Scaffold this active site. Structure first.
Site, PDB file in Angstrom:
ATOM      1  N   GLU A  35      -6.652 -12.304   0.378  1.00 32.38           N
ATOM      2  CA  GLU A  35      -6.468 -11.032   1.086  1.00 32.38           C
ATOM      3  C   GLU A  35      -7.604 -11.043   2.109  1.00 32.38           C
ATOM      4  O   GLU A  35      -7.380 -10.861   3.325  1.00 32.38           O
ATOM      5  CB  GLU A  35      -6.571  -9.819   0.120  1.00 32.38           C
ATOM      6  CG  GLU A  35      -5.713  -8.584   0.462  1.00 32.38           C
ATOM      7  CD  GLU A  35      -4.292  -8.909   1.053  1.00 32.38           C
ATOM      8  OE1 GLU A  35      -4.439  -9.264   2.221  1.00 32.38           O
ATOM      9  OE2 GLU A  35      -3.298  -8.791   0.401  1.00 32.38           O
ATOM     10  N   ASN A  46      -2.445  -4.560  12.324  1.00 28.47           N
ATOM     11  CA  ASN A  46      -1.017  -4.819  12.087  1.00 28.47           C
ATOM     12  C   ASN A  46      -0.407  -4.351  13.410  1.00 28.47           C
ATOM     13  O   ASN A  46      -1.047  -3.610  14.187  1.00 28.47           O
ATOM     14  CB  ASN A  46      -0.553  -4.046  10.838  1.00 28.47           C
ATOM     15  CG  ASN A  46      -1.386  -4.392   9.632  1.00 28.47           C
ATOM     16  OD1 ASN A  46      -2.189  -3.367   9.144  1.00 28.47           O
ATOM     17  ND2 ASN A  46      -1.441  -5.494   9.116  1.00 28.47           N
ATOM     18  N   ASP A  48       1.977  -2.142  13.804  1.00 24.71           N
ATOM     19  CA  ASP A  48       2.377  -0.730  13.753  1.00 24.71           C
ATOM     20  C   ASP A  48       1.144   0.111  14.085  1.00 24.71           C
ATOM     21  O   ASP A  48       1.217   1.356  14.175  1.00 24.71           O
ATOM     22  CB  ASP A  48       2.934  -0.401  12.351  1.00 24.71           C
ATOM     23  CG  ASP A  48       1.824  -0.217  11.348  1.00 24.71           C
ATOM     24  OD1 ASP A  48       0.771  -1.117  11.449  1.00 24.71           O
ATOM     25  OD2 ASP A  48       1.826   0.607  10.450  1.00 24.71           O
ATOM     26  N   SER A  50      -1.772   0.334  12.544  1.00 26.05           N
ATOM     27  CA  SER A  50      -2.641   0.505  11.373  1.00 26.05           C
ATOM     28  C   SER A  50      -3.538  -0.731  11.309  1.00 26.05           C
ATOM     29  O   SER A  50      -3.292  -1.744  11.998  1.00 26.05           O
ATOM     30  CB  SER A  50      -1.810   0.644  10.117  1.00 26.05           C
ATOM     31  OG  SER A  50      -1.436  -0.622   9.581  1.00 26.05           O
ATOM     32  N   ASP A  52      -6.140  -2.948   8.341  1.00 26.94           N
ATOM     33  CA  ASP A  52      -6.385  -3.252   6.926  1.00 26.94           C
ATOM     34  C   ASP A  52      -7.901  -3.375   6.769  1.00 26.94           C
ATOM     35  O   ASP A  52      -8.597  -3.940   7.639  1.00 26.94           O
ATOM     36  CB  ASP A  52      -5.645  -4.551   6.542  1.00 26.94           C
ATOM     37  CG  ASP A  52      -4.184  -4.296   6.284  1.00 26.94           C
ATOM     38  OD1 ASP A  52      -3.613  -3.241   6.500  1.00 26.94           O
ATOM     39  OD2 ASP A  52      -3.555  -5.240   5.890  1.00 26.94           O
ATOM     40  N   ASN A  59      -4.781  -0.321   3.556  1.00 27.15           N
ATOM     41  CA  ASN A  59      -4.222   0.175   4.821  1.00 27.15           C
ATOM     42  C   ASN A  59      -4.565   1.607   5.228  1.00 27.15           C
ATOM     43  O   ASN A  59      -4.652   2.518   4.376  1.00 27.15           O
ATOM     44  CB  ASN A  59      -2.681   0.086   4.774  1.00 27.15           C
ATOM     45  CG  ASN A  59      -2.093   0.033   6.159  1.00 27.15           C
ATOM     46  OD1 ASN A  59      -1.537   1.221   6.619  1.00 27.15           O
ATOM     47  ND2 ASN A  59      -2.025  -0.968   6.851  1.00 27.15           N
TER      48      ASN A  59
HETATM   49  C1  LIG Z   1       2.747  -8.087   8.206  1.00 27.31           C
HETATM   50  C2  LIG Z   1       2.598  -7.522   6.863  1.00 27.31           C
HETATM   51  O1  LIG Z   1       3.381  -7.843   5.958  1.00 27.31           O
HETATM   52  N1  LIG Z   1       1.544  -6.710   6.641  1.00 27.31           N
HETATM   53  C3  LIG Z   1       1.003  -6.465   5.372  1.00 27.31           C
HETATM   54  C4  LIG Z   1       1.006  -4.969   4.991  1.00 27.31           C
HETATM   55  O2  LIG Z   1       2.377  -4.605   4.980  1.00 27.31           O
HETATM   56  C5  LIG Z   1       2.966  -4.450   6.309  1.00 27.31           C
HETATM   57  C6  LIG Z   1       4.106  -5.429   6.347  1.00 27.31           C
HETATM   58  C7  LIG Z   1       1.930  -4.728   7.373  1.00 27.31           C
HETATM   59  O3  LIG Z   1       0.812  -5.016   7.164  1.00 27.31           O
HETATM   60  O4  LIG Z   1       2.472  -4.709   8.569  1.00 27.31           O
HETATM   61  C8  LIG Z   1       0.370  -4.789   3.654  1.00 27.31           C
HETATM   62  O5  LIG Z   1       0.246  -3.585   3.334  1.00 27.31           O
HETATM   63  C9  LIG Z   1       1.215  -2.943   2.489  1.00 27.31           C
HETATM   64  O6  LIG Z   1       2.057  -2.174   3.311  1.00 27.31           O
HETATM   65  C10 LIG Z   1       3.142  -1.544   2.597  1.00 27.31           C
HETATM   66  C11 LIG Z   1       3.952  -0.828   3.611  1.00 27.31           C
HETATM   67  O7  LIG Z   1       3.229   0.167   4.285  1.00 27.31           O
HETATM   68  C12 LIG Z   1       2.593  -0.583   1.542  1.00 27.31           C
HETATM   69  O8  LIG Z   1       3.637  -0.083   0.708  1.00 27.31           O
HETATM   70  C13 LIG Z   1       4.136   1.229   0.892  1.00 27.31           C
HETATM   71  O9  LIG Z   1       3.445   2.011  -0.088  1.00 27.31           O
HETATM   72  C14 LIG Z   1       3.867   3.403  -0.154  1.00 27.31           C
HETATM   73  C15 LIG Z   1       2.988   3.949  -1.300  1.00 27.31           C
HETATM   74  O10 LIG Z   1       2.754   3.013  -2.321  1.00 27.31           O
HETATM   75  C16 LIG Z   1       5.374   3.523  -0.352  1.00 27.31           C
HETATM   76  O11 LIG Z   1       5.656   4.908  -0.154  1.00 27.31           O
HETATM   77  C17 LIG Z   1       6.173   2.678   0.595  1.00 27.31           C
HETATM   78  O12 LIG Z   1       7.512   2.596   0.233  1.00 27.31           O
HETATM   79  C18 LIG Z   1       7.961   1.387  -0.379  1.00 27.31           C
HETATM   80  C19 LIG Z   1       9.268   1.044   0.250  1.00 27.31           C
HETATM   81  C20 LIG Z   1       8.067   1.550  -1.881  1.00 27.31           C
HETATM   82  O13 LIG Z   1       9.272   1.948  -2.227  1.00 27.31           O
HETATM   83  O14 LIG Z   1       7.164   1.422  -2.637  1.00 27.31           O
HETATM   84  C21 LIG Z   1       5.659   1.235   0.533  1.00 27.31           C
HETATM   85  N2  LIG Z   1       6.343   0.368   1.457  1.00 27.31           N
HETATM   86  C22 LIG Z   1       7.255  -0.531   1.066  1.00 27.31           C
HETATM   87  C23 LIG Z   1       8.362  -0.738   1.957  1.00 27.31           C
HETATM   88  O15 LIG Z   1       7.161  -1.185   0.002  1.00 27.31           O
HETATM   89  C24 LIG Z   1       1.614  -1.309   0.621  1.00 27.31           C
HETATM   90  O16 LIG Z   1       1.005  -0.353  -0.227  1.00 27.31           O
HETATM   91  C25 LIG Z   1       0.536  -2.037   1.469  1.00 27.31           C
HETATM   92  N3  LIG Z   1      -0.391  -2.786   0.605  1.00 27.31           N
HETATM   93  C26 LIG Z   1      -1.662  -2.453   0.392  1.00 27.31           C
HETATM   94  C27 LIG Z   1      -2.617  -3.598   0.120  1.00 27.31           C
HETATM   95  O17 LIG Z   1      -2.064  -1.276   0.472  1.00 27.31           O
HETATM   96  C28 LIG Z   1      -1.005  -5.425   3.582  1.00 27.31           C
HETATM   97  C29 LIG Z   1      -1.619  -5.558   2.169  1.00 27.31           C
HETATM   98  O18 LIG Z   1      -1.683  -6.891   1.722  1.00 27.31           O
HETATM   99  O19 LIG Z   1      -1.000  -6.769   4.052  1.00 27.31           O
HETATM  100  C30 LIG Z   1      -0.478  -6.948   5.370  1.00 27.31           C
HETATM  101  O20 LIG Z   1      -0.468  -8.357   5.588  1.00 27.31           O
END
Ligand SMILES: CC(=O)N[C@@H]1[C@@H](O[C@H](C)C(=O)O)[C@H](O[C@@H]2O[C@H](CO)[C@@H](O[C@@H]3O[C@H](CO)[C@@H](O)[C@H](O[C@H](C)C(=O)O)[C@H]3NC(C)=O)[C@H](O)[C@H]2NC(C)=O)[C@@H](CO)O[C@H]1O
Length: 129
Positions: A35, A46, A48, A50, A52, A59
């Site tokens: 990570e 990212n 969008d 945001s 990390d 995030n």
């Molecule tokens: C490019 C990439 O993949 N980036 C990774 C982050 O995710 C996106 C894709 C990004 O960075 O552009 C990743 O961080 C993780 O993001 C997701 C989406 O925002 C978070 O999950 C959401 O969490 C909330 C609350 O838990 C939910 O309401 C959302 O609804 C989903 C659908 C669910 O039903 O649970 C979640 N989104 C989805 C679609 O699952 C993660 O919580 C978040 N992770 C962390 C660490 O906080 C980061 C982390 O490794 O890494 C980027 O590379």
């Protein structure tokens, strides 16, 4: 600060993360390695807009305020910068919430893709734990 594999294992444990919600200590050291390379000063933007933050790369769109991510819910009630200091307390505390809250450690793309289903115990071999 850039933690040692073992040093961090030790610290996360002390912080009550070993088996938190059913994830072995190793699951955590692993996620953190891939990570952030055990570097707490790490950040990554990212698409969008945001960003990390920390050893566990929390995030800003949901967990913490860095004051330039708009949709922003600050569920952790922490300024993102806090997540970067050498005491990992704030990161654990917040990481606990992230993981409880539904998708377990899947919330960490890195954990899911490179950690999940590998024998993660290998990360805490050698350690006085
Ligand atoms: C490019 C990439 O993949 N980036 C990774 C982050 O995710 C996106 C894709 C990004 O960075 O552009 C990743 O961080 C993780 O993001 C997701 C989406 O925002 C978070 O999950 C959401 O969490 C909330 C609350 O838990 C939910 O309401 C959302 O609804 C989903 C659908 C669910 O039903 O649970 C979640 N989104 C989805 C679609 O699952 C993660 O919580 C978040 N992770 C962390 C660490 O906080 C980061 C982390 O490794 O890494 C980027 O590379």
């Amino acid at each position: 600060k850039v933690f040692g594999r073992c040093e961090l294992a030790a610290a996360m444990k002390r912080h009550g993360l070993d088996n938190y919600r059913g994830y072995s200590l190793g699951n955590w050291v692993c996620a953190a390695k891939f990570e952030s390379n055990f570097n707490t000063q790490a950040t990554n933007r990212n698409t969008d807009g945001s960003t990390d933050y920390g050893i566990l790369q929390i995030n800003s769109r949901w967990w913490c305020n860095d004051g330039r991510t708009p949709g922003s819910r600050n569920l952790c009630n922490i300024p993102c910068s806090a997540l970067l200091s050498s005491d990992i307390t704030a990161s654990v505390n917040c990481a606990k919430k992230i993981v409880s809250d539904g998708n377990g450690m899947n919330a960490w793309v890195a954990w899911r893709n490179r950690c999940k289903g590998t024998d993660v115990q290998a990360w805490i071999r050698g350690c006085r734990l």
